[PDB]
Structure formats: structure tokens, C-alpha cells
């Protein structure tokens, strides 16, 4: 394919489910799946912001079938901010408000 000029990718379509998105727990490995089957042919990335405390790491893998597995680990508790972008865009729901007990 030389030219494309077709296939607009939308973020509002990208859906996400799980706990990590809603809330997380120190030590506990929070994971969340992102469906992009009817979203677009764009790339999926993450930008875990560190407004209060940084994260241990971020495991991102494209299990396929239009599913992206992303898991992380925290060390401190409080108010967190999850930033998920979808090919130069921001999924519907971010920045998400994650509260850790």
C-alpha cells in the first residue's frame, strides 16, 4: 500500500474494562484490557503520569484480536491519574481517577 488517506481512527470508540482503571491496590497487580476492534487502525500507547508517585513498571502487550493487555504496579497509595491515548487521541474516560487504599 503506497497511499492510504482512508481509515479514520476514533478514540471515543475504544473501550476499556477492569479494576486498574477504576481503582488499584498497593502491591496488587492491576490489569486492564482495551478493545480497539471498531476503533481504528491506529497505535495504542500509555502515559502513566506521576503527579504524586511513579509506577514500578508498565507491561504492555497486544494479545491480538484487537485486544491490548496493559498491567502496572504501584508502591504508594492515594490518588492516581491514568492517561491512555489512542493514536494521537485520548480514550473516553481519561484522565481516569484511580484511588488506591
Amino acid at each position: 500500500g503506497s497511499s492510504g488517506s482512508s481509515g479514520s481512527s476514533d478514540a471515543s470508540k475504544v473501550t476499556s474494562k477492569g479494576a486498574g482503571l477504576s481503582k488499584a491496590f498497593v502491591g496488587q497487580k492491576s490489569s486492564f484490557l482495551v478493545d480497539c476492534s471498531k476503533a481504528g487502525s491506529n497505535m495504542l500507547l500509555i502515559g502513566v503520569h506521576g503527579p504524586t508517585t511513579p509506577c514500578e513498571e508498565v507491561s504492555m502487550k497486544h494479545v491480538g484480536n484487537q485486544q491490548y493487555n496493559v498491567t502496572y504496579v504501584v508502591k504508594e497509595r492515594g490518588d492516581y491519574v491514568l492517561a491512555v491515548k489512542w493514536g494521537e487521541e485520548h480514550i473516553p474516560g481519561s484522565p481516569f481517577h484511580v484511588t488506591v487504599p
Side-chain angles (χ1 to χ4, degrees), residues 11-60:
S12 300
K13 305 292 272 270
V14 167
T15 51
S16 61
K17 75 279 271 297
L21 306 154
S22 199
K23 61 162 79 206
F25 294 64
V26 183
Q28 304 190 55
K29 210 199 271 83
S30 274
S31 90
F32 60 85
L33 207 288
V34 184
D35 195 314
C36 294
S37 179
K38 69 203 203 292
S41 62
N42 271 7
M43 78 82 78
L44 196 77
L45 74 316
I46 319 286
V48 286
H49 209 107
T52 178
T53 50
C55 210
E56 288 293 319
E57 65 187 42
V58 179
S59 168
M60 315 162 50

